[PDB]
Structure 1
């Protein structure tokens, strides 16, 4: 027959994650000669991360993508990637290698299996930077007192509290309204998502904190995956791998465009000195011990090994 597979996600038009899933869609169609069709429900068409991944887990959707921080709703183990400053941009290829070809990726795959999901793409999303609507922020101490939107990650909540901020978990689709209404003073995200989602209209200041690393985890309902013929299973996984290579390749080009757009629209972007970054690293480091019982030590070590 034909097979139609629905894929929902929260990310904005033109965003690195979004474009990756457009490439996935194209590759699935090519490899199947049109027999398998991915229907894309991006940009919170069917809701934000949690609600659509819950639908994928239940089987009311075939596929969904959630940011890794929002995946904490489904397993605590994903929080390894939220630990503040567990990774930094300088080591990204070695992180990719461990996920793609190594033991780390196998462990992630097992986490997904344990919650009824088949991973198809570990999409790059990027490093979050703190941004504000009104308050000048240039240093760690300037973050104090800010009311800040978070994802659902317990670690993001704890990071904010350790920085002296007041964390406020808001779904992605509702975050712009909260900023516009003054419910929150700021947020932390990639400059690209912020620009693509047109948060840049309400923002005034940014710092290159890189205080959270996120992926966008594209998951298929495991029962649905296991129901498919083997040739279609292989199409999906091969398309995922090829789409991931493509999506990583365009990510930093798009990030550069967004940083330029921030500039153009008058947002002040402060580059932290080594000293000021080290303060942030240490101020957030106590969060790690608060989650030692929820994140396997072996998994922390596999991630840290990528940064050596």
Structure 2
């Protein structure tokens, strides 16, 4: 008989992550001649990122996708990815290869297995960049004393404080109002999201700080995966790997288009000098020490090895 597999995620129609999951669904049905069907539950239809991931861990749902920062709720080891300047866009190809094929990908599988999960796709999300409403930012010093919106992420807060900024955690839904009303001076996020949410309407300045990286992790319940016939496991594995090839590339293209949209809307986008980049790196490096007790040195090293 048919195998029906539920996949919950929090993302909206047309989003880079949502569309990777559509390709995954398509590829599963092709490779299986229709025997296996992924049923998509996007847009938090089955609950928040956290609720649907816990369902996947406990086995009341087959698959779910969570952002790498939210995965830190299940194991703080996932914070390795959030550490400021642990990776940079220059080296992304080597990062993907390590995650997909390498010792890094093996270590992550171990971590996922310890919390009841099997990784299927490490969907690209991308790098966050600082933006402001009124205060020109072109250098690392321009950041000092900025009131900046953050999420609840510990690393986000510490990065802001390390740079001399005053972090204010504000929910996403409240952030546009806060910028418009001036309770914060700026934020840090992807160009794609800022453009898609039209934060660009209130922003005037951007720098290519690339000070945080994230992914969206599609996981299957490990016991469920282990209960499947080898040919089905391989279909899922292959489909996720193949879907990821497109999703990674689509994400890059969308980010380029978003940056173009910033410039078309009159936003000044400053490409930081080597000197200024070096200042952001060195100012934020002390954050790693604040979090190293929950992040194994071996995992940090594996990620670092992808950047050389």
TM value normalised by structure 2: 0.90
Displacement, 1:275?
0.9
**1:200 aligns to what SS in structure 2?**
helix
Aligned to 1:178: 178
* CA–CA separation in structure 1 for the residues paired with 2:104 and 2:120: 15
Identify which range, 236-245 or 222-231, moves more after superposition.
222-231
In the alignment, structure 1 segments of 5+ residues that lack a partner are none
**Kept after mapping to 2: 8 A contact 1:150/1:156:** yes
Rate the CA distance shift 1:223–1:194 in 2: closer, same or farther, 3 A.
farther
Displacement, 1:200?
2.7
* CA–CA separation in structure 2 for the residues paired with 1:133 and 1:44: 30
Identify which range, 122-131 or 143-152, moves more after superposition.
143-152
Displacement, 1:70?
2.1
**Kept after mapping to 2: 8 A contact 1:128/1:189:** yes
TM value normalised by structure 1: 0.90
Identify which range, 178-187 or 30-39, moves more after superposition.
178-187
Aligned to 2:141: 141
Rate the CA distance shift 1:113–1:177 in 2: closer, same or farther, 3 A.
farther
* CA–CA separation in structure 2 for the residues paired with 1:48 and 1:142: 36
Aligned to 1:81: 81
Displacement, 1:174?
6.0
Displacement, 1:284?
0.4
Number of equivalent positions: 308
In the alignment, structure 2 segments of 5+ residues that lack a partner are none
* CA–CA separation in structure 2 for the residues paired with 1:273 and 1:145: 21
Displacement, 1:48?
4.4
**1:266 aligns to what SS in structure 2?**
coil
String of CA shifts for 1:72-117, please: whole Å, max 9, x gaps: 1111111111111111111111111211111011001111111111
Rate the CA distance shift 1:25–1:293 in 2: closer, same or farther, 3 A.
same
**Kept after mapping to 2: 8 A contact 1:48/1:172:** no
**1:217 aligns to what SS in structure 2?**
strand
Q: Note if 1:130 corresponds to 2:99.
A: no
Displacement, 1:27?
0.6
1:214-253 paired onto structure 2 within 5 Å: 214-253=214-253
Identify which range, 145-154 or 105-114, moves more after superposition.
145-154
String of CA shifts for 1:224-245, please: whole Å, max 9, x gaps: 3233333322221111011011
**Kept after mapping to 2: 8 A contact 1:48/1:173:** no
* CA–CA separation in structure 2 for the residues paired with 1:234 and 1:8: 21
* CA–CA separation in structure 1 for the residues paired with 2:239 and 2:31: 8
* CA–CA separation in structure 1 for the residues paired with 2:6 and 2:12: 17
**1:122 aligns to what SS in structure 2?**
strand
Rate the CA distance shift 1:223–1:281 in 2: closer, same or farther, 3 A.
same
Displacement, 1:192?
1.4
